[PDB]
Amino acid sequence: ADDPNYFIGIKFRHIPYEYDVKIPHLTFGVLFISDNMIPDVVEIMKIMKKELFEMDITTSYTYMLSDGIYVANVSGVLATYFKMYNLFYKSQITFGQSRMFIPHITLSFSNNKTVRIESTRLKISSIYLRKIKGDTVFDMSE
Ligand SMILES: Nc1ncnc2c1ncn2[C@@H]1O[C@H](COP(=O)(O)O)[C@@H](O)[C@H]1OP(=O)(O)O
Numbered sequence: 001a002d003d004p005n006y007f008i009g010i011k012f013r014h015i016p017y018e019y020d021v022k023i024p025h026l027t028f029g030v031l032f033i034s035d036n037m038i039p040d041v042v043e044i045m046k047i048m049k050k051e052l053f054e055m056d057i058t059t060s061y062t063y064m065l066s067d068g069i070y071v072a073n074v075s076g077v078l079a080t081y082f083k084m085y086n087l088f089y090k091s092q093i094t095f096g097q098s099r100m101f102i103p104h105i106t107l108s109f110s111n112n113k114t115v116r117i118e119s120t121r122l123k124i125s126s127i128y129l130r131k132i133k134g135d136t137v138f139d140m141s142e
Helices: 035-047 049-054 078-090
Strands: 006-012 026-032 057-066 069-073 104-108 116-122 124-131 136-140
Touching (some): 026 078, 026 104, 035 124, 035 136, 049 124, 057 104
Antiparallel strands (some): 006 026, 006 124, 057 116, 069 104, 124 136
16 A cells, blocks of 8 residues: 555664754655554564664765655665565565655755765664554564
8 A cells, every 4th residue: 555554664873964853764664554464574574684784774975855855865775675575575465655665864854955975884773663653563673
C-alpha cells in the first residue's frame, strides 16, 4: 500500500550537519502490516542485523529532496535495502512504495540550500521498527 502504518528506521550517534528536526533518522523501508505479522517482520529485522551494522554509510552533501524538505544524502545502504526487500517480499509482507526509494536524513522541513563536507561515515546507534504517528514496538542496538 501507499498508506504505510509502520516503518523501519535507523538512528546515528552523531550527524555532521545542523538540523531543526526533533528526531534525526534514516528511514529504511515502510510497511503495511497487521499486528499478527509483527513477529515475522521482527525476524527479518533480526536476520539482517549483521549486514545492517557492517554497512558503510556516508554523507558528502545536503540537498532539497522536494519543496520544503531539506535533507542529507546517505550512501552504502542500497544493496542491503534490496536484500531485505527480497526477504520481506518472499514472506509476503507489504514493503515498499510505488515511488522509488531514496535514502536520506531529513535535516529540516524548510527551504535551505546545499552545504558540503568531506566524505564522512555515519555510525549507527539504533535500528528500530515503529508505527507511523505511533509508538516504537521494536529496537536493536549493536
Ligand atoms: N523519493 C522521494 N521523493 C520525494 N520526496 C520524498 C521521497 N521519499 C520521501 N519523501 C518525502 O520526504 C519526507 C522525509 O520524511 P522522512 O523523515 O521519513 O525521511 C517524507 O515524508 C516524504 O514526504 P511525502 O511522503 O509527502 O512525499
